[PDB]
Amino acid sequence: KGNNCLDAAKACNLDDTCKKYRSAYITPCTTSMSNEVCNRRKCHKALRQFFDKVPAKHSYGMLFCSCRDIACTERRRQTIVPVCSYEERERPNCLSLQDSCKTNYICRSRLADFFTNCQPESRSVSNCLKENYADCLLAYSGLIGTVMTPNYVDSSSLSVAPWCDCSNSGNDLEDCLKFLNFFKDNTCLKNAIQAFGNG
């Protein structure tokens, strides 16, 4: 019949606010006219502006839409223009990157928020509360445009990750995995994204 992610794009283009800031990030983030290299900093800057200036209603539709097929997931994954905002030659160690984020006020503030709002309700109950769903979505969306820009990593789940791996962890291996799995396997974050596209 179409898409929910495509449904979202129509709502955004037909809204003067969303449309303006969408184009304001696509501009510095998009290549593909030649392959070339984007200005990562202008792109990141434009991305932060998108989620801070456009209301959640329109700005989340784009990012947290539900999908029925692999084509839909590909649209959803291109939301943030990953070729520019996300991927690099290699992936650094995650703890290395965590350190690099903590030296940037903006990123440090955002990572703290993610870790605060996107965690289990209690000591056994995997999922967070439902009225905490919005503030977790606010924190994940907020990471976009930082050095810790995340994205969806496959077709069959709502698993997300930043651009880092746990190669060269040494004795710190479990903590690195613990950090990366806080993105990849977050029960509260999956459930918040599942509730937004109700069903």
Partner 1 sequence: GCVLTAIHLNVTDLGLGYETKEELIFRYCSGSCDAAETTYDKILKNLSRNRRLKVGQACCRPIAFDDDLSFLDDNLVYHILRKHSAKRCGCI
In the complex, the residues that contact partner 1 under the rule CB under 8 A are 2-3, 6, 9-10, 13-14, 16, 19-20, 22-24, 26-27, 30, 32, 74-75, 78, 81
Smallest gap from residue 57 Cβ to partner 1 (A)? 18
Closest CB to partner 1 among residues 67, 164: 67
Comparison of 27 and 126: residue with beta carbon closer to partner 1: 27
Smallest gap from Cβ 22 to partner 1, in A, equals 5
In this structure, which amino acid lies at residue 57? K
Name the residue nearer to partner 1 (CB basis): 11 or 134.
11
Beta carbon nearer to partner 1, 19 or 40? 19
- Taking the complex as a whole, the smallest distance from the CB of residue 137 to partner 1 amounts, in Å, to 22
Contacting residues for 187 by C-beta, under 8 A, at least 6 apart: 120, 126, 127, 128
Q: How far is the CB of 10 from partner 1 (least distance, A)?
A: 5
Provide the token pair at 63.
Answer: 């990012």
Of all helices (H) and strands (E), which one includes residue 161? strand 160-162
**CB atoms near residue 8 (< 10 Å):** 24
Other beta carbons within 10 Å of 53 = 13
In this structure, are residues 23 and 47 in contact, taking their beta carbons and an 8 Å threshold?
Answer: no
